[PDB]
């Protein structure tokens, strides 16, 4: 929640998702992974960009 003083009138600013591989699975590169989300008539498509510096890692 984005409000600490009163969380009742707040909204979600950050979301965390825990991800693992399935049992007996081949390795997966996360750079070729696309994430889809649907909320209130908005379809998002999120993508990770690999970099040496200034990377979200």
Ligand X SMILES: *[C@@H]1O[C@H](CO)[C@H](O)[C@H](O[C@@H]2O[C@H](CO)[C@@H](O[C@@H]3O[C@H](CS(=O)(=O)O)[C@H](O)[C@H](O[C@H]4O[C@H](CO)[C@@H](O)[C@H](O)[C@@H]4O)[C@H]3O[C@H]3O[C@H]([C@@H](O)CO)[C@H](O)[C@H](O)[C@H]3O)[C@H](O)[C@H]2O)[C@H]1O
Ligand Y SMILES: *[C@@H]1O[C@H](CO)[C@H](O)[C@H](O[C@@H]2O[C@H](CO)[C@@H](O[C@@H]3O[C@H](CS(=O)(=O)O)[C@H](O)[C@H](O[C@H]4O[C@H](CO)[C@@H](O)[C@H](O)[C@@H]4O)[C@H]3O)[C@H](O)[C@H]2O)[C@H]1O
Ligand Z SMILES: *[C@@H]1O[C@H](CO)[C@H](O)[C@H](O[C@@H]2O[C@H](CO)[C@@H](O[C@@H]3O[C@H](CS(=O)(=O)O)[C@H](O)[C@H](O[C@H]4O[C@H](CO[C@H]5O[C@H](CO)[C@@H](O)[C@H](O)[C@@H]5O)[C@@H](O)[C@H](O)[C@@H]4O)[C@H]3O[C@H]3O[C@H]([C@@H](O)CO)[C@H](O)[C@H](O)[C@H]3O)[C@H](O)[C@H]2O)[C@H]1O
Interface residues toward ligand X, by CB under 6 A: 2, 4, 13-14
Question: What is the DSSP code string of 1-44?
Answer: ---SS-GGG-----------PPTT-----GGG-EEEEE-SS-EE
- Residues 1-57 binding a second copy (CB under 8 A) are 6, 8-9, 32, 34, 38, 40-47, 49
Number of residues that bind ligand Y (CB under 6 A): 2
| Cα–Cα distance measured from residue 33 to residue 48, given in angstroms and rounded to the nearest whole number | 8
- Residues 4-43 binding ligand Z (CB under 6 A) are 5-6, 9
Applying CB under 8 A, the residues found at the interface with a second copy are 6, 8-9, 32, 34, 38, 40-47, 49
């Amino acid at each position: 929640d984005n409000n600490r003083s009163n969380p009742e009138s707040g909204s979600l600013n950050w979301t965390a998702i825990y991800v693992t591989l399935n049992t007996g699975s081949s390795p997966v590169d996360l750079s070729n992974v696309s994430l889809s989300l649907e909320y209130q008539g908005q379809l998002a498509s999120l993508k990770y960009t690999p970099a040496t510096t200034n990377a979200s890692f």
